[PDB]
Amino acid sequence: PPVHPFVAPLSYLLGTWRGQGEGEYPTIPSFRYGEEIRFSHSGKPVIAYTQKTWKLESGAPLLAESGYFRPRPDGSIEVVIACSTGLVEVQKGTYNVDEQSIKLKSDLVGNASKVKEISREFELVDGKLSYVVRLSTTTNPLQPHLKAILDKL
Amino acid sequence: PPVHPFVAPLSYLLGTWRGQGEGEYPTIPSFRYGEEIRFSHSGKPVIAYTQKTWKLESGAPLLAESGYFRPRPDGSIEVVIACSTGLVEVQKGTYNVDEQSIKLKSDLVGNASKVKEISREFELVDGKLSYVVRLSTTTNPLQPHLKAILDKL
Ligand code: MNH
Ligand code: MNH
């Protein structure tokens, strides 16, 4: 199906991406992981998102998440994500065509024992997809947790 | 990868399913749809769920959802779902091995303008996957909205 007019400004996402990331938080040792993301669509004003992570050395599965990105022509966007850990997120924010960036902060984080807010920021950098995930808890303010860079396949 | 011991009691779900459903609610005309579901896993105590619906006559896409089922050996289960409409759900309940049923009710429905609670109940009936989705709003009590039967492919 043709790309919906609301999806077209984010058409640079469509496809599959693979790369590597690093995680950290004040309470844990830093770690690395592999990551794969697919963005797809079915002609609606929605982009399907599906992701997985693995251990770099072996390919052993780690986690997975999936959801939907809903951009609008005013530059606003809402993203919903379900995670294999048992969390859900409602993310809201904006996208910027000139910067090829997407900036999101959570309206809600569901079913979490400790996490309070999550922000997710994407940028296309020399054709590669970069992001940063930040998270807070009741006692740790919003701060970096994950960052990755992925090549388009 | 081998099926995780927590997933094994629900191994009857694993695969792809296709069939048809019907929708209704006091405020809308009844409708029919096609549906496809895939349940998969990666050796963790989690089953990935991915679903889509379409118009019967043409195959034209309607909606999609996806998430994760997390069963535990005491018979409890938690399910998280993100939907292409922009909703998320945290579902909790139980599964019953002798009945091949799963009964869930929402702890939380996120980003909904009108929906308050959702229940989802699955049953394997002569090898076919049946479900009922019920929903409430502030003014309409919990009641049937969707029901479908799918054949295993
Ligand atoms: C967005 C999703 C996401 C959320 C909300 C998240 C949240 C957390 C929270 C909360 C903690 C523990 C902090 C505390 O103060 O006790 C933690 C730690 C950790 N996380 Mn992560 N994390 C990921 C993504 C996330 N993690 C991914 C993806 C991976 C790897 C593929 C990963 C790997 C870890 C590891 C490893 C730890 C350390 C183990 C632990 O303390 O639980 N992660
Ligand atoms: C679980 C997910 C799910 C939820 C929370 C849901 C919720 C609703 C709500 C709320 C309404 C409007 C009721 C009101 O009182 O105004 C409505 C109507 C409707 N729904 Mn459904 N619905 C689906 C699944 C869902 N629907 C699926 C799947 C389809 C089709 C593939 C579908 C098709 C419809 C149609 C068609 C209408 C009528 C249009 C409307 O009033 O918006 N649906």
UniProtKB/Swiss-Prot annotation, chains A, B:
Q: Does the keyword Thylakoid apply?
A: no
What subcellular locations does the record give? Cytoplasm
Q: Chief location of this protein?
A: cytoplasm
* Superkingdom of origin: Eukaryota
User: By its UniProt entry, which Pfam families does this protein fall under?
Assistant: THAP4_heme-bd (PF08768)
Q: Which Gene3D superfamilies match?
A: 2.40.128.20
Per the record, its GO cellular-component terms are: cytosol
Where does this protein act, in terms of pathway? Nitrogen metabolism
Q: Which reaction does it catalyse?
A: peroxynitrite = nitrate
Per the UniProt entry, the Enzyme Commission number(s) are 5.99.-.-
Required co-factors: heme b
Query: Can you quote the record's cofactor note?
Result: Binds 1 heme b group per subunit, that coordinates a highly solvent-exposed Fe(III) atom.
Where do the annotations place heme b binding?
A: T27, H145
State the CDD domains in the record. Answer: lipocalin_heme-bd-THAP4-like (cd07828)
Q: Does the keyword Kinase apply?
A: no
Q: Which SUPFAM superfamilies does this one have?
A: Lipocalins
- What positions does the record give for the motif labelled GXWXGXG? 15-21
Q: What does the annotation say about its assembly with partners?
A: Homodimer.
Reported function: Heme-binding protein able to scavenge peroxynitrite and to protect free L-tyrosine against peroxynitrite-mediated nitration, by acting as a peroxynitrite isomerase that converts peroxynitrite to nitrate. Therefore, this protein likely plays a role in peroxynitrite sensing and in the detoxification of reactive nitrogen and oxygen species (RNS and ROS, respectively). Is able to bind nitric oxide (NO) in vitro, but may act as a sensor of peroxynitrite levels in vivo.
Q: Domain annotation text?
A: Forms a 10-stranded antiparallel beta-barrel structure able to accommodate a hydrophobic ligand in its interior. In fact, this fold hosts the heme group, which is located in a wide surface cleft.
- PANTHER family the UniProt entry points to: PEROXYNITRITE ISOMERASE THAP4, THAP4 PROTEIN
Report the sequence similarity comment from the record.
Belongs to the nitrobindin family.
Write down what this protein is called. Answer: Peroxynitrite isomerase Rv2717c
What is the species listed in this Swiss-Prot or TrEMBL entry? Arabidopsis thaliana (Mouse-ear cress)
